[PDB]
Amino acid sequence: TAHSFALPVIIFTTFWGLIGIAGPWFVPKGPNRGVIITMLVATAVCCYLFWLIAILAQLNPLFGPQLKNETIWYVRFLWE
Amino acid sequence: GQFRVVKEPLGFVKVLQWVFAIFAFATCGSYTGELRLSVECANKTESALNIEVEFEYPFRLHQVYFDAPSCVKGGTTKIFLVGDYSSSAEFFVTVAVFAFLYSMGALATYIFLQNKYRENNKGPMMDFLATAVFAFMWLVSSSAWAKGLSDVKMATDPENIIKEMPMCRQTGNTCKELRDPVTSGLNTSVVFGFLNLVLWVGNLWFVFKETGWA
Amino acid sequence: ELFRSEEMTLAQLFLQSEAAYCCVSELEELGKVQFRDLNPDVNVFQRKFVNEVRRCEEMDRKLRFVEKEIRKANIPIMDTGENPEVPFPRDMIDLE
Amino acid sequence: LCCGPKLAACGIVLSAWGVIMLIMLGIFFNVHSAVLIEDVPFTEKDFENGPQNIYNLYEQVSYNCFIAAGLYLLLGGFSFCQVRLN
Amino acid sequence: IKVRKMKAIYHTLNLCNIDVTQKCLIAEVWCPVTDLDSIQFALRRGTEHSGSTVPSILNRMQTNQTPPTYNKTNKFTHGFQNIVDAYGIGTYREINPAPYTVITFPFLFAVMFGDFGHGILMTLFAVWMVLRESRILSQKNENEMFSMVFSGRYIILLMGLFSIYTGLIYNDCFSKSLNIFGSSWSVRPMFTIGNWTEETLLGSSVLQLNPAIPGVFGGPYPFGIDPIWNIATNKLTFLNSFKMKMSVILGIIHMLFGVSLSLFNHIYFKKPLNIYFGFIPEIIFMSSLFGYLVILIFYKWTAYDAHSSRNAPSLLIHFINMFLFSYPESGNAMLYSGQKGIQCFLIVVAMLCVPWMLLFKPLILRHQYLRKKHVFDFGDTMVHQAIHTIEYCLGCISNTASYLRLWALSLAHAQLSEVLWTMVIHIGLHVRSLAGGLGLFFIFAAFATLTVAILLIMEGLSAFLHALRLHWVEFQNKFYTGTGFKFLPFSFEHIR
Amino acid sequence: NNPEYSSFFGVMGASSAMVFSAMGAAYGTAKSGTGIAAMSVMRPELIMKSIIPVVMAGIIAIYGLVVAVLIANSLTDGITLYRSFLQLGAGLSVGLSGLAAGFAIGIVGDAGVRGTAQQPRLFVGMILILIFAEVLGLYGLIVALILSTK
Ligand SMILES: CCCCCCCCCCCCCCCCCC(=O)OC[C@H](COP(=O)([O-])OCC[N+](C)(C)C)OC(=O)CCCCCCCCCCCCCCCCC
Ligand SMILES: CCCCCCCCCCCCCCCCCCCC(=O)O[C@H](COC(=O)CCCCCCCCCCCCCC)COP(=O)(O)OCCN
Ligand SMILES: CCCCCCCCCCCCCCCCCCCC(=O)O[C@H](COC(=O)CCCCCCCCCCCCCC)COP(=O)(O)OCCN
Ligand SMILES: CCCCCCCCCCCCCCCCCCCC(=O)O[C@H](COC(=O)CCCCCCCCCCCCCC)COP(=O)(O)OCCN
Ligand SMILES: CCCCCCCCCCCCCCCCCC(=O)OC[C@@H](O)COP(=O)(O)OCC[N+](C)(C)C
Ligand SMILES: *[C@@H]1O[C@H](CO)[C@@H](O)[C@H](O)[C@H]1NC(C)=O
């Protein structure tokens, strides 16, 4: 179970960048164009920041999880 | 009953797509493999002359395990296979099952409600959408299943298993194989997946012509 | 839009008394006009139209009483959705 | 057995929630999700030879969850019948 | 309806001038500029209906009185606009926090209430209210709480959606993670390369895991917190730090966005004095002191790994030393080269921003308004600017601290959900006998009622109001004034 | 190795986290019930709305119960002095924080139930103050969760 920090970062960065950058140019024109664009950009920024904080916090762990002996025994068999 | 619909070239394509991916489900989801090894340590009394292991279709190989000899004090060390390819095997199996169900539904509709299916070309448009989705799914799944089969042949390979086993690193210990898994089923499943992808690609043009977009 | 408050401006209207009621009724329907007290020197309870407002309040009391009897009885109260405008002419006599 | 429509609505929403969540819990237990290992009622002896005993206990708990889901399905049916009555 | 409008119209005409000054009525009104033509057309309708030959006439006039605040509220934006208006109606034509709130209030709520399952429940409830809104709107009741919630239905819907997202990120669903991609933590390398055996498993009650050995930690989890932390007894040790850093980061970035909005306000209102003393000193102070902290957090995350764990510095101690000028020759080493010099420079700039705000603006005001043209009270102006500078500088610290309520409430929600699960439905799940399937019925009824009452209602309300408090104080003190008047038009609401 | 008395401090921490939180929630419930009873004689329709402070006192009690259960499930025969006193500190934190938060909730709710009876608009203000009063005990619980799992 090798989770490379290239596919996730690229995929999520490009997805949220599209949502927050291209979407304002695609929103239809009307009274709510401005508010909808604000929601698109703010959702992009907030969700991307949260996900980035999580992924970085997990990256480079200074200590491993502490698992009871029963669950370590079970996980050895089940998980990779 | 519009058996003429089935007999028509589009109906023949639907019947072929029903038979295919069902052959694939039978080949893959019923696959069951076995491997046999033997280890003669420095002391013959501690030799593991016969060790047999069995695995199923899902290829959750990292779960498969066996107590290989340690060659020291006659003890045993638990050894697991390396890596799993369920993400590809189960994905292809589910794609094939969905394709078979869709083919059965399409055949039933053509035999019974072909007029409703052809009405307003809305049914042809839905068929074209499903055909594009299935073509993309098959294109991904064929490569995924081929890679999974190759990597599974590598991982389940007794040569690789022995090479990774620390018994060979000892003095006098000799590890050999006895049998290998039957790759015929996996190869046939890969061939059937490629054939299903080709059938979906061909049916894309037929669906486009039926919908009038041609 | 919602980015910042709308450009706001004062305005003053000259309108002849006869048409004033109807005009302010149209304004009330429109809803984009906010009047302001221009005679704060005299309290509300002494202004020119206090007689009219008092009679309107009495009419509202009458309607409340009749509605209360309606509720006391099992009879239901309809709901059409129409919003007719008050009759600027002296239809108050007929309504009373 | 006529009863309040509010109570019937609460019963049906609880039935739907229970059915969905308990069915998912049973599916996960049956898949042997390691996250729910603490909920398995195993003993010291179950760690003797291999994981098959823990798998069997996982399946037992999944069966319990499916039984609960079916009972909640019956409860939701009763609530729906009461709603139709009201 | 007829009599109520008639009463309202006559009471309105009371406010207008009377024949004591002129036979023609005089009316004074606030109106948006764009609707002047529509108002004139309405007056035309009034003239036609009345049959009076003379037309009523409208006239503009340059004014000094303060215009009201009108936001052109929408159905979807009504909840958020009321939410931001509660703490004071915005002044005339200043940056409205509503459009950004529309996302940042649901998002801050989700940062605390983050839970996939509870978010699912909340979004389903909000969707029910949205779908059946016409029914409930027609069937009016006096239940104040339910009326409040229904009016906030869109707020609850967005809160549920973002709570679903944050629950996915936390990998939390009724206190249980998901493991949809596969954990990066493999236990086998511990026995293969590491120094473990079944003897060690027997001897150690809880043991632990390390990523130093090669294959244990296979990269970060692609999306959300890794599932293994759910079953790790070390869970809190890691979640506490990660969530504290997350809270501080989000709070500081929110406050920085607020300060930028304040710059926008000053530019529109044409206060270059404020732009050059005020905002710029404020942004420099905030960024140097606390933005540098976010940079430090991210840099430590990207730099320090398991092998360098031993000498990994503590950013708390490093920030304390940054403020105290207490860079020691013993203890944890410096995070990066030149830390002493860069941090000293940052502290110097931060402290210099205090005189920048305090002394400059009052002196320029006094100069250009008492030496030129010649009431201005220099002592009072100095006192006011000193109060503003002290308030802002202490506020930076206290607000970066108060944004820790995100982590506090998130950890509380997670722990309450965990204890509820383990005390209610663990009972129904940890039963060998198949007869337990019947007990799970009632045990889960209790679990559902408890989740809806303790967590969805009360913890959700607390998180909602604390996101509100954050927006009102921590975020909006940077750019918002809220010293205007709500525009109350002569609109007929007698429809009731 | 470890003193036979090492578990006393952890046991007492669990007991405190329960007892002091219970006392704070009892004070909150009692004051809020007094306010609701005084108000209801004239405004019967506000009882359900005004029952909120009682619920928040219950929430304080729930935080106390949670931390007490954690410590009680963490106690062990060989509990070292380090863990024992960590749990004592967590229990003191939760207990005293819940005590003070319950006092504040009781007083504020007794004031605000009567106030809302007179002025309907005061209900939201009372709720706003009460949530702060409750998150005081929540802060206590947060420190307890940090400590008992240090
Ligand atoms: C199955 C359960 C699923 C979970 C669902 C519940 C989730 C828990 C969190 C819900 C909190 C609800 C409060 C926010 C919604 C109100 C905001 C809004 O848009 O209205 C503007 C509100 C009310 O609307 P209004 O009447 O002002 O509307 C404007 C009308 N004019 C313009 C004419 C004046 O306006 C304000 O006063 C703004 C301040 C709101 C601050 C909120 C205080 C807390 C309220 C607590 C509600 C009751 C607790 C829950 C009880 C549940 C049991 C029945
Ligand atoms: C480091 C992390 C934090 C980063 C945050 C800062 C970086 C992101 C924001 C940078 C600024 C983005 C662009 C600003 C607006 C420029 C104006 C043109 C925008 C556009 O194309 O849309 C117009 C509408 O915009 C509108 O109606 C206004 C759109 C405003 C977009 C910005 C709002 C979101 C920022 C908040 C982030 C979330 C909080 C972070 C914690 C259409 O023109 P039109 O015809 O409508 O004419 C305008 C009046 N109607
Ligand atoms: C679960 C994981 C994901 C969570 C994170 C994303 C959550 C996004 C939350 C926003 C989605 C819900 C929006 C409200 C839906 C109901 C519509 C209400 C009425 C409506 O149309 O509102 C208009 C406002 O614009 C709107 O209604 C806005 C619609 C378009 C918004 C686009 C931005 C969506 C978020 C970013 C993209 C998606 C990211 C996640 C994949 C104006 O009201 P009206 O004219 O109808 O009023 C009629 C009377 N006046
Ligand atoms: C509206 C938005 C307002 C602004 C919000 C953002 C907050 C701004 C905060 C103040 C300005 C930026 C931060 C300045 C303090 C220094 C930051 C150092 C970050 C850090 O750890 O980088 C390491 C040091 O860099 C080095 O080794 C290089 C030398 C040290 C750093 C040089 C200065 C870099 C920053 C330039 C200014 C950027 C301004 C941003 C607004 C990487 O180094 P390593 O790990 O490879 O080395 C280690 C072995 N030697
Ligand atoms: C009223 C409205 C309705 C409300 C709806 C609420 C729905 C709530 C349903 C869930 C509640 C219970 C939560 C339990 C979650 C844990 C399940 C879990 O972990 O899942 C995944 C496991 O099965 C698989 O993971 P594994 O077997 O450990 O590893 C194998 C995984 N690989 C193959 C990807 C590596
Ligand atoms: C013995 O244990 C230590 C400590 O974890 C480990 O670093 C080392 O590699 C082990 N040595 C072996 C397995 O030979």
**Token code pair at residue B158:** 């007794």
**Token code pair at residue B183:** 């790759």
DSSP character for E478? Answer: G
Q: Please choose, from the candidates F64, F16, F8, F58, the residue with its C-alpha nearest in 3D space to the C-alpha of residue F33.
A: F58
Structural domain of F58: 1-150
Amino acid identity at C82: E
Buried/exposed B107-144: b ≥16 CB within 10 Å, e otherwise = bebbeeebeebeeeeebbeebbebbeebbebbeebbeb
Query: What are the DSSP calls for E363-409, one per residue?
Result: HHHHIIIIIS-----HHHHHHHHHHHHHHHHHHHHHHHHHTTHHHHH
User: CA dist D10 to D56, D83, E128, E131, F99, Å?
Assistant: 35, 11, 14, 18, 35
For residue B66, report the phi and psi dihedrals to the nearest 5 degrees: -160, 155
B83 phi-psi bin (left φ>0, alpha ψ -120 to 50, beta other)? left
Q: Give the residues surrounding ligand 1 with Cβ less than 6 Å away.
A: E 79, 82-83, 86, 121-122, 125, 145-146, 148-149, 151-152, 155-156, 452, 456-457, 460-461, 464; F 124, 127
* Secondary structure of C23-72 as H, E, C letters: HHHHHHHHCCCEECCCCCCCCHHHCCCHHHHHHHHHHHHHHHHHHHHHHH
Cα–Cα distance measured from residue B32 to residue F74, given in angstroms and rounded to the nearest whole number: 46
Q: Please choose, from the candidates B15, B11, B18, the residue with its C-alpha nearest in 3D space to the C-alpha of residue B206.
A: B11
Cα–Cα distance measured from residue E288 to residue E302, given in angstroms and rounded to the nearest whole number: 21
Enclosing H/E stretch for C16: strand C8-16
Q: At what angle do helices E78-85 and E153-170 cross, to 10 degrees?
A: 90
**Token code pair at residue E496:** 């009731």
- Taking contacts as CB-CB distances below 8 angstroms, the residues of chain D near A71 are 34, 37-38
Cα–Cα distance measured from residue E398 to residue E77, given in angstroms and rounded to the nearest whole number: 30
Contact F124, F45 (CB under 8 A): no
Which residues are B53's β-sheet partners? B35
> Are A54 and E191 in contact (CB < 8 Å)?
no
Q: How far is the CA of E296 from the centre of ligand 4 (A)?
A: 8
Cα–Cα distance measured from residue B211 to residue B118, given in angstroms and rounded to the nearest whole number: 9
Enclosing H/E stretch for D58: helix D52-85
Cα–Cα distance measured from residue E419 to residue F17, given in angstroms and rounded to the nearest whole number: 15
Cα–Cα distance measured from residue B102 to residue F44, given in angstroms and rounded to the nearest whole number: 62
Residue of the nearest CA to atom 4 in ligand 2? A45
User: CA dist B142 to B19, B95, B195, Å?
Assistant: 17, 10, 9
Half-sphere exposure of B10 (CA within 13 A, CB side): 23
For residue E464, report the phi and psi dihedrals to the nearest 5 degrees: -60, -50
**DSSP SS3 for B67:** strand
Shortest CA distance from A38: residue in chain C: C3
DSSP character for D59? Answer: H
**DSSP SS3 for E196:** coil
Q: Please choose, from the candidates E90, E50, E52, the residue with its C-alpha nearest in 3D space to the C-alpha of residue E72.
A: E90
- Taking contacts as CB-CB distances below 8 angstroms, the residues of chain A near B58 are none
Structure solved via: cryo-EM
> Are D68 and E441 in contact (CB < 8 Å)?
yes
Cα–Cα distance measured from residue E55 to residue E40, given in angstroms and rounded to the nearest whole number: 10
Number of structural domains found in chain F: 1
Residue whose tokens read 């020197």: C41
Instruction: Give the sign of the dihedral formed by CA E279, CA E281, CA E284, CA E285.
Output: negative
Residue whose tokens read 């920041």: A49
Residue whose tokens read 């920090």: A5
**Token code pair at residue E456:** 């969805």
Residue of the nearest CA to atom 9 in ligand 3? E158
**Token code pair at residue E289:** 């002191």
For residue C5, report the phi and psi dihedrals to the nearest 5 degrees: -60, 155
**Token code pair at residue C52:** 């009219």
In the sheet where E57-60 sits, what is the strand order? C34-35, E24-32, C8-16, E57-60
Q: Please choose, from the candidates B83, B32, B86, B80, the residue with its C-alpha nearest in 3D space to the C-alpha of residue B56.
A: B32
Cα–Cα distance measured from residue D78 to residue D2, given in angstroms and rounded to the nearest whole number: 11
**DSSP SS3 for B72:** coil
Q: At what angle do helices C50-72 and E2-15 cross, to 10 degrees?
A: 160
Residues 6 or more apart whose CB falls under 8 angstroms from that of B125 comprise B211
> Are E29 and C26 in contact (CB < 8 Å)?
no
| Count of positions (residues) in chain F | 150
User: CA dist D2 to D10, D63, E257, Å?
Assistant: 15, 33, 58
Please report which ligand is nearest the Cα atom of E246.
2
Number of structural domains found in chain A: 1
Cα–Cα distance measured from residue E69 to residue E75, given in angstroms and rounded to the nearest whole number: 18
Q: What is the CA radius of gyration of chain B?
A: 24
Cα–Cα distance measured from residue B12 to residue B33, given in angstroms and rounded to the nearest whole number: 35
User: CA dist F39 to E92, F48, F111, F124, Å?
Assistant: 41, 12, 10, 17
Residues 6 or more apart whose CB falls under 8 angstroms from that of E115 comprise E163, E166, E167, E170, E172, E173, E174, E175, E413, E414, E417, E455
For this entry, resolution in Å reads 3.5
> Are D14 and E438 in contact (CB < 8 Å)?
no
Enclosing H/E stretch for E28: strand E24-32
Q: Please choose, from the candidates F70, F114, F94, F81, the residue with its C-alpha nearest in 3D space to the C-alpha of residue F19.
A: F94
**Token code pair at residue E433:** 């006998």
**DSSP SS3 for E59:** strand
Q: Please choose, from the candidates B139, B118, B136, the residue with its C-alpha nearest in 3D space to the C-alpha of residue B127.
A: B118
Q: What is the CA radius of gyration of chain C?
A: 18
Cβ count near F82 (within 10 Å)? 11
Cα–Cα distance measured from residue A30 to residue D82, given in angstroms and rounded to the nearest whole number: 47
- Taking contacts as CB-CB distances below 8 angstroms, the residues of chain A near C3 are 34
Amino acid identity at B28: C
Residue of the nearest CA to atom 48 in ligand 2? A34
Q: Please choose, from the candidates E288, E409, E261, E286, the residue with its C-alpha nearest in 3D space to the C-alpha of residue E348.
A: E288
Enclosing H/E stretch for B68: strand B65-69
Amino acid identity at E435: A
Contact C44, E55 (CB under 8 A): no
C69 in E contact zone (CB under 8 Å): no
Considering only CB atoms, F66 lies closest to which of E405, E419, E458, namely E419
Q: Please choose, from the candidates B31, B141, B153, the residue with its C-alpha nearest in 3D space to the C-alpha of residue B83.
A: B153
Pairing relationship of beta strands B76-80 and E24-32 according to DSSP bridges: unpaired
In the sheet where B174-179 sits, what is the strand order? B48-56, B32-40, B174-179
- Taking contacts as CB-CB distances below 8 angstroms, the residues of chain A near B83 are 80
Q: How far is the CA of E341 from the centre of ligand 4 (A)?
A: 12
Query: What are the DSSP calls for F39-53, one per residue?
Result: HHTT-GGGHHHHTHH
Contact F15, F36 (CB under 8 A): no
Residue of the nearest CA to atom 29 in ligand 3? A36
Cα–Cα distance measured from residue E290 to residue E296, given in angstroms and rounded to the nearest whole number: 10
Chains F and E touch (3+ CB pairs under 8 A): yes
Cβ count near E176 (within 10 Å)? 23
For residue E363, report the phi and psi dihedrals to the nearest 5 degrees: -65, -45
Contact F139, F60 (CB under 8 A): no
Query: What are the DSSP calls for F84-119, one per residue?
Result: HHHHHHHHHHHHHHHHHHHHHHHHHHHHHHHHHHH-
Residues 6 or more apart whose CB falls under 8 angstroms from that of D58 comprise D29, D30, D32, D36, D40
Q: Please choose, from the candidates F1, F6, F25, the residue with its C-alpha nearest in 3D space to the C-alpha of residue F94.
A: F25
> Are A31 and C1 in contact (CB < 8 Å)?
yes
| Count of positions (residues) in chain E | 496
Q: Does any ligand 6 atom lie closer than 6 A to the CB of residue E195?
A: yes
Residue of the nearest CA to atom 27 in ligand 5? D33
Contact E219, A5 (CB under 8 A): yes
Cα–Cα distance measured from residue D31 to residue E495, given in angstroms and rounded to the nearest whole number: 58
Cα–Cα distance measured from residue E7 to residue E121, given in angstroms and rounded to the nearest whole number: 47
Cα–Cα distance measured from residue E344 to residue E338, given in angstroms and rounded to the nearest whole number: 10
C30 phi-psi bin (left φ>0, alpha ψ -120 to 50, beta other)? alpha
D35 in E contact zone (CB under 8 Å): yes
User: CA dist F118 to B48, E144, E305, F127, Å?
Assistant: 89, 16, 61, 16
Cα–Cα distance measured from residue E479 to residue B192, given in angstroms and rounded to the nearest whole number: 65
Cα–Cα distance measured from residue E147 to residue E142, given in angstroms and rounded to the nearest whole number: 8
Structural domain of A46: 2-79
- Taking contacts as CB-CB distances below 8 angstroms, the residues of chain E near A4 are 219
**Token code pair at residue B164:** 């990774």
Residues 6 or more apart whose CB falls under 8 angstroms from that of F56 comprise E458, F28, F105, F109, F130, F131, F133, F134
Substitution site in E190, E192, E195 for ligand 6 pocket (most atoms within 8 Å of beta carbon): E195
Cα–Cα distance measured from residue D25 to residue B193, given in angstroms and rounded to the nearest whole number: 34
Cβ count near E331 (within 10 Å)? 10
Report angle CA A55, A58, A63 to the nearest 5 degrees: 175
Q: Please choose, from the candidates B103, B99, B107, B104, the residue with its C-alpha nearest in 3D space to the C-alpha of residue B6.
A: B107
> Are E429 and D64 in contact (CB < 8 Å)?
yes
Q: Please choose, from the candidates E250, E211, E255, E215, the residue with its C-alpha nearest in 3D space to the C-alpha of residue E232.
A: E211
Torsion of CA E432, E433, E434, E436, to 10 degrees: -80
For residue F76, report the phi and psi dihedrals to the nearest 5 degrees: -145, 165
Enclosing H/E stretch for E184: none
Contact E89, E69 (CB under 8 A): yes
